């Protein structure tokens, strides 16, 4: 297993910021050999945008992931299927995601769609939950890529995201290969949310 702790800042309408503390861990599914990486950082830049042609609730994502501080499956563009099932304070909803993943430049292009109507939480609060095996590792660090070395069997991603002064998401994710497309199947349970706090009140400015 490996661990990462980070805090995402979300801008609010009233100028203030909403903080999202992340506890993340990853566990290989396969019973085989994996790499135990030293401390290293993942530097993520990430932009969100809209398809103007899409009438459904959606989020376009462009992301560049790069490390600083059993892999051949990624030598090129891998397809991605993402499926999230969540309920937040009893709100049942699903997000479906398609796109490509090029590990060679640490770039992800994915478009996500709310399958069940209106998304009951702001899309930014679901970004860090909605495939870090695509992050580009330099060659002096090619040995510290846990994610790739757990493939195609995959790994389990488990993360609790608590929003200060508000509720918390608890997600479970299976990130594996499924017939030469990479899949992220995720459950998400949010509890104890203020029914008109930043999240359920939809008070987050939309970018990140």
């Amino acid at each position: 297993r490996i661990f990462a702790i980070f805090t995402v800042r979300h801008n609010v309408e009233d100028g203030s910021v909403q903080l999202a503390d992340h506890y993340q861990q990853n566990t290989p599914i396969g019973d085989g050999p994996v790499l135990l990486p030293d401390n290293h950082v993942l530097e993520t830049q990430t932009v969100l945008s809209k398809d103007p042609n899409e009438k459904r609730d959606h989020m376009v994502l462009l992301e560049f992931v790069t490390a600083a501080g059993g892999e051949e499956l990624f030598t090129g563009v891998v397809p991605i299927l993402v499926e999230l099932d969540g309920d937040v304070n009893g709100h049942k909803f699903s997000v479906r995601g398609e796109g490509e993943g090029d590990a060679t430049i640490g770039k992800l292009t994915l478009k996500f769609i709310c399958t069940t109507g209106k998304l009951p939480v702001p899309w930014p609060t679901l970004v860090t939950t909605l495939v870090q095996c695509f992050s580009r590792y330099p060659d002096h660090m090619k040995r510290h890529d846990f994610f790739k070395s757990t493939m195609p069997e995959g790994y389990v991603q488990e993360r609790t995201i608590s929003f200060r002064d508000d509720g918390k998401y608890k997600t479970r994710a299976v990130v594996k290969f499924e017939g030469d497309t990479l899949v992220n199947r995720v459950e998400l349970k949010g509890t104890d949310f203020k029914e008109d706090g930043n999240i359920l009140g939809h008070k987050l400015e939309y970018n990140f």
């Binding site: 297993r1 990462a4 702790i5 135990l36 290293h40 830049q45 990430t46």
Partner: peptide
């Protein structure tokens, strides 16, 4: 922009 520190069990 964000950087993320990954540990080890």
């Amino acid at each position: 922009h964000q950087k993320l520190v990954f540990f080890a069990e």
